[PDB]
């Protein structure tokens, strides 16, 4: 194990990580619950909460850089006026994970991510 | 002395207090025993200051460390070499009985193991609050146990 390791690099190049992540992100603040592996859940976890704290501060500084992650101009305004304002009293814990029954024909992992 | 542990605590009530992580014993050197107070400090009040003190920490771990890392001295190319350099350098014979000469340098694994540095002078020493300053070295990464034994220079 890498001394002081964090954020899995998956089995694909770096540029391949900041691409797939952009999906599970918007799809999370657009629908609600998203099924995925336990690894992805732990990964997307931070990439999502770190995007929510930005909206909490509002302003434009947390909008230009934010857009660098998600491209949907529909889910962006959301954070700047939807669920983040609901956590204006809660410091953290924006996302929530939970394990479930194994895959279908495949081993594991499996979990559903949803906002608390 | 509550969480995790349970049996070691109750098995310590024998005239004493506050249990550490791992009880370590010593040898003969004329010192106090369980009859006056039963509590050793960090002053030693005898080992004398100025002298050097040894430090036995716990070595780190590089996983299934190869052989080129437990010796660091094996040539090899990579851009065209078939040895890829990293290779152990291909050790062994081809048509000789012997017995693969056991004990010879090989990859193997690595992990926590005693080290001991010995010697090493001291710059500052403080008691009560507990704290010591060793001249660099200090085996293992901050998070072990260490024995910080006096000095077995003899």
């Amino acid at each position: 194990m890498r001394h002081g390791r964090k954020v899995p690099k998956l089995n694909r190049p770096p540029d391949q990580r900041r691409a797939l992540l952009r999906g599970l992100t918007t799809q999370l603040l657009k629908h609600g619950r998203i099924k995925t592996t336990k690894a992805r859940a732990r990964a997307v976890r931070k990439y999502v909460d770190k995007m929510i704290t930005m909206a909490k501060d509002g302003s434009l500084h947390k909008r230009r850089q934010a857009l660098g992650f998600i491209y949907e101009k529909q889910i962006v305004h959301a954070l700047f006026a939807e669920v983040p304002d609901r956590y204006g009293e809660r410091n953290g814990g924006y996302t929530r994970i939970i394990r479930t029954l194994p895959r279908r024909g495949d081993n594991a992992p499996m979990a559903y991510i949803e906002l608390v | 002395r509550d969480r995790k542990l349970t049996k070691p605590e109750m098995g310590h009530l024998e005239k004493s207090g506050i249990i550490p992580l791992r009880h370590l014993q010593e040898f003969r050197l004329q010192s106090i025993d369980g009859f006056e107070v039963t509590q050793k400090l960090d002053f030693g009040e005898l080992f004398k200051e100025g002298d050097l003190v040894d430090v036995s920490g716990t070595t780190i771990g590089k996983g299934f460390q190869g052989g080129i890392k437990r010796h660091n001295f094996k040539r090899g190319q990579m851009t065209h070499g078939s040895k890829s350099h990293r290779q152990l350098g291909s050790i062994g014979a081809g048509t000789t009985p012997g017995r693969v000469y056991k004990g010879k340098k090989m990859p193997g694994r690595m992990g926590g193991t005693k080290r001991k540095i010995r010697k090493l002078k001291i710059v500052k020493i403080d008691d009560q609050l507990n704290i010591i300053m060793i001249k660099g070295a200090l085996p293992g990464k901050p998070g072990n146990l260490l024995r910080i034994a006096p000095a077995k220079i003899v």
Partner: protein, 122 residues
């Protein structure tokens, strides 16, 4: 061997499989259906409908209650294999075989004889 139901020509194997039935052996009809639904192995099927196949029928066909049922016999045997061919290098080092399975278990009541006896003076 009271009731023996299962089948044959399964699309499973003889190695990967069986390792699932060797755990349900000597187990009740419940202790076996509460573990298979947790076994992340494909062998769980059609072995799942198996434990249910040996049962249920033995309830209306014969005089066997739902309880006291335990897997007496159980074993996976290799049936018929097919010699397939797959290219690789000039075609020579090949044979190929599909180890099929046709396990055949059986359920039956349980013996046991308990009769506690004590004295209560009043």
């Amino acid at each position: 061997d009271e009731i023996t139901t299962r089948g044959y020509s399964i699309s499973m194997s003889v190695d990967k499989a069986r390792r699932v039935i060797d755990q349900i052996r000597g187990r009740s009809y419940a202790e076996t259906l509460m573990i298979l639904e947790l076994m992340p192995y494909r062998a769980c099927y059609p072995i799942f409908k198996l434990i249910y196949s040996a049962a249920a029928n033995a309830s209306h066909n014969k005089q066997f209650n739902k309880a006291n049922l335990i897997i007496s016999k159980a074993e996976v045997n290799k049936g018929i294999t097919l010699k397939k061919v797959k290219p690789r290098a000039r075609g020579r080092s090949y044979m190929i075989l599909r180890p099929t399975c046709h396990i055949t278990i059986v359920l039956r009541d349980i013996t046991h004889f308990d009769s506690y006896d004590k004295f209560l003076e009043s």
